[PDB]
């Protein structure tokens, strides 16, 4: 009930959270980098021109 | 009749009492610690909200 560090469930959650945060952030960061590049933005503009 | 220290019954009671007091106090202390934590108090409040 106390949720002490020794108990397995509490330790697992903390370990999982650190890994999850890093993984989630890394995937998002990569996407942002692609978005940041001018060419990716330009490609979207090109697509709009292309469809009409 | 004298209840002298040498007699087995007197010695047993004294030894048992020390162990019993420590055991009773320790169990109670653990319960108090759980009660002391804010989350346990919060859980009771949540339960009241949950039932209605």
From Swiss-Prot, chains A, B:
Compartments where found:
Cell inner membrane
Q: Which domain of life is it from?
A: Bacteria
Domain remark in the UniProt entry: A helical hairpin is formed by residues 25-137 which is conserved in all known ESCRT-III proteins. Helix 5N-5C (residues 193-217) contacts the helical hairpin 3 subunits away and is essential for oligomerization. The C-terminal flexible linker and alpha-helix 6 (residues 220-256) are not required for oligomerization and do not resolve in electron microscopy.
Q: What does this protein do?
A: A membrane remodeling protein capable of forming rings and/or filaments on membranes, which then curve and tubulate the bilayer. Rings will form on liposomes, altering their positive curvature so the lipid bilayer is remodeled into a negative curve as the membrane enters the ring. Ring stacks of varying lengths can be seen joining isolated liposomes. A lipid monolayer can be drawn into the center of the rings. Required for thylakoid formation.
Family per UniProt? Belongs to the PspA/Vipp/IM30 family.
Query: Partners and quaternary state?
Result: Polymerizes to form rings, filaments and ribbons. Rings are formed by stacked rungs that tilt to give a dome-shaped curvature. Rings form with symmetries ranging from C11 (55 subunits) to C17 (119 subunits).
Q: What is this protein called?
A: Membrane-associated protein Vipp1
Q: Which organism is it from?
A: Nostoc punctiforme (strain ATCC 29133 / PCC 73102)
Full-sequence portion shown in this chain: 156 to 207 of 258
């Amino acid at each position: 009930v106390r949720g002490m560090n020794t108990s397995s469930a509490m330790s697992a959650f903390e370990r999982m959270e650190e890994k999850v945060l890093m993984q989630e952030s890394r995937a998002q960061a990569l996407g942002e980098l692609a978005g940041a590049d001018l060419e990716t933005q330009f490609a979207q503009l090109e697509g709009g021109s292309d469809v009409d």
